[PDB]
Amino acid sequence: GPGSMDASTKKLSESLKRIGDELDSNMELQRMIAAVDTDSPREVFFRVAADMFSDGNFNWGRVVALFYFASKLVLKALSTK
């Protein structure tokens, strides 16, 4: 926890670290995403992925955004057998 040698580099890292934590701490996304129908979690997710690939949209650094989203849905269902 307590450590500081490159206060200028640590400062940039601090701002980015908060964005990552806030991304996961975004209660609005947690509830909206938590509302994904429980009788077909794979179908609702297949629609998001299918529409993204169907329109030919593939921006950079967005595929990884899908990895956390896909990671959260599979783990959420894996922790609630």
Place this chain on the structure above:
Amino acid sequence: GPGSMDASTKKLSESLKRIGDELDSNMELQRMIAAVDTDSPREVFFRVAADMFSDGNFNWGRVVALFYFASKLVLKALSTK
């Protein structure tokens, strides 16, 4: 959004689509990273990447920002033609 039937599912997907695209529009963030001293930009990145692996910690949703930033920073500097 040409063609639709489950506007509730498409709207949820739209939120995820807007988070990735809207972030790409955050010019302020781009300016902060663009301030990395020209003296070998990989040096300031090595400081953050080294610390992330140095303590053995890996918070969920941090790697996404590291791949999005590391991948976006290397291609940006590699696109010098």
